[PDB]
Design a protein around this ligand. Sequence first.
Ligand SMILES: Nc1ncnc2c1ncn2[C@@H]1O[C@H](CSCC[C@H](N)C(=O)O)[C@@H](O)[C@H]1O
Length: 379
Amino acid sequence: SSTFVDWNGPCLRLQYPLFDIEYLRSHEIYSGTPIQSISLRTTAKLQSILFSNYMEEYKVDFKRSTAIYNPMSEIGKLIEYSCLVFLPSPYAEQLKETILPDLNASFDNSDTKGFVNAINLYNKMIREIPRQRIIDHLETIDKIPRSFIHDFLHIVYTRSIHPQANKLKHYKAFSNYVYGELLPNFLSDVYQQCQLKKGDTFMDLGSGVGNCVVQAALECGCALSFGCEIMDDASDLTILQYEELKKRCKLYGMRLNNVEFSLKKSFVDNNRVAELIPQCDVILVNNFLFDEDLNKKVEKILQTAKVGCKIISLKSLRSLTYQINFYNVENIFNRLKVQRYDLKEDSVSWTHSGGEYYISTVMEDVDESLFSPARVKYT
Ligand SMILES: Nc1ncnc2c1ncn2[C@@H]1O[C@H](CSCC[C@H](N)C(=O)O)[C@@H](O)[C@H]1O
């Protein structure tokens, strides 16, 4: 017996108004146009928990592949999240005992008819709950499963990025533009280590399709989550994903703080990047495949960072043998505290295990030390 979500996972503390209660109380009809899963390439419709008029159709096939994007897996997670997060006692009980056991078994056994029956039973039960009870409950939530945002973002991702993922892997003349992804759990760990919080400014130099930027906004409520990406197709996919994300957020009454991108342009000699650096609290840069030249450019860009700013990277920013001399006396690298960490399993897309990452903090004074002596179920 297993669950679609880890009911024992870590819970995230909400440090900003994630659910817009007034919006929900004033909006009962969803008019958004989210990408329906069934449009990607037996069926069942999943009834929206908050909007009576919304239902999404999923293709249900335990034979036809599955794996990577698994429609049934998403449903299992959504239905469980209802029981875990969106329902008030008592209904959370009825749902928990009445649907989950059969939903999970039917799944594990590749039992189509049983799986669909559990879904249809889930829909019937959900429609019997007074809407205002669900909303009144959301209003009390102060903590949520760390996996919620991850799974919520994965849904958006399966809909907007996955279908055209191949466009992100076109022949790369330079390693500088090779696409690599930092994964959700790694991002969650690192944002926490840097204490990314409400009102902060977050920047991702080389944002890819925006995964790191949107996660920063959703899980920390940053005043501004910004990303710059130069590749054309990564940039188009960023727009599609961003668009789908806004619709899904509305479907769940979630607030999405300011998200901004500087697309199809270099972050080098980028005036918006330059004007934002000084106010950034956290700067992320996956320089794993960056060459010496580019790293030098990144170095230049970071010169105006403020005291306290934390920079996350996969390769140290400062040469391991960086010693203060006479040609680098004013470089911000001189007052940067560097801390190395081991990469946990499956933190990045290019490797299963191994590796490391760094968190460099901008300190007020210089470091004397530098002077010379003289993309699965649970139990
Ligand atoms: N000068 C430059 N300006 C903007 N983006 C650049 C750049 N040099 C490299 N990049 C981009 O930086 C990206 C980093 S790989 C993606 C990282 C992204 N932070 C994520 O975790 O999903 C590459 O896809 C590449 O397109």
